[model samples]
Target: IFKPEELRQALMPTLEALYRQDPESLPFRQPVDPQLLGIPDYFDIVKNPMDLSTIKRKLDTGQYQEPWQYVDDVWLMFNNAWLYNRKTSRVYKFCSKLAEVFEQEIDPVMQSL
Candidate 1:
C-alpha cells in the first residue's frame, strides 16, 4: 500500500496555518475594479445592439438564415453557464444574482411573446 504520511504531514502545517489565520484577512481581500471582473460602466460603450433595420432587411431577403442570428442568445446562455459554474464565493454569488435577473426579467419577456 502506498503511504500518504508524508503528504499528510506536509499538508497539516499548511492546514493549521490556514485555520490559524482570520479568513477575512486572506490575500484575496484585495479589491478589484468592477471592470476588471467584466462589469462595464453605463457609459462605457461596450456592446452595441445590431441595427434592427439591417436585421429586418437581411431577414426579408433570406440572407440571415445562419446560426449567427442567435449569437446574442448563445453568448448570454454560454456566459451564464460559465459564470454559474465558477468556484469562487464572490463570483459565484454575483453570477447567481445575474442569473436571477435573467430569469426574473427574461422569463417574463419571453412569456409575453
Candidate 2:
C-alpha cells in the first residue's frame, strides 16, 4: 500500500532494532553458515532461504514492490528456522520470540496506513 521510499523508511528501523536489541540476536542478523553450522543440507530442506540482511538489502534497493511481499519474506525467514530447528533448540525459541516482536512492531506501522 506504500511506495518503496515509504516502505524502506518504515521497515528499516524495526529490522535494525531487532538486531540491536540484544547480543542474542546475532544469529538472526545474518544467514546461517550452513557448512559451519553443520547443516549442509539446509538449502536442501529450506528451499527458499531468507535472512535479515537479505531483507534489508532488498528493502534498501527497492526489490520489494509492496509491504505484504516484504512482510512475507520476514515471516518466511522465521518459518524457515522453525522448520529446520528442533522445537527444543535455542534457535527455534529465538525465532519464536523475535517473530512475536516482529508482529508487534509491524502492527502499528501497518495500521498507520
Show the colliding residue pairs in model 1.
none
Each candidate structure's TM-score, on Cα atoms with residue i matched to residue i, is: 0.29, 0.89
lDDT tens readout by residue for model 2, 38-83: 8899998899998888888899999988777888998999999899
Residue 96 alpha-carbon offset, candidate 1, angstroms: 0.8
lDDT of 2 at 27: 69
Clashes of 2: 0
Cα lDDT of all candidates, in order? Answer: 0.36, 0.83
Q: Write the per-residue lDDT of candidate 1 for residues 1-113, one digit (tens) a residue.
A: 21234323322332233223343223222332346756555124323322223333333444433323423432343253344344566544544444444344444333432
For residue 43, what is the lDDT in candidate 2?
A: 91
TM-score, candidate 2, is 0.89
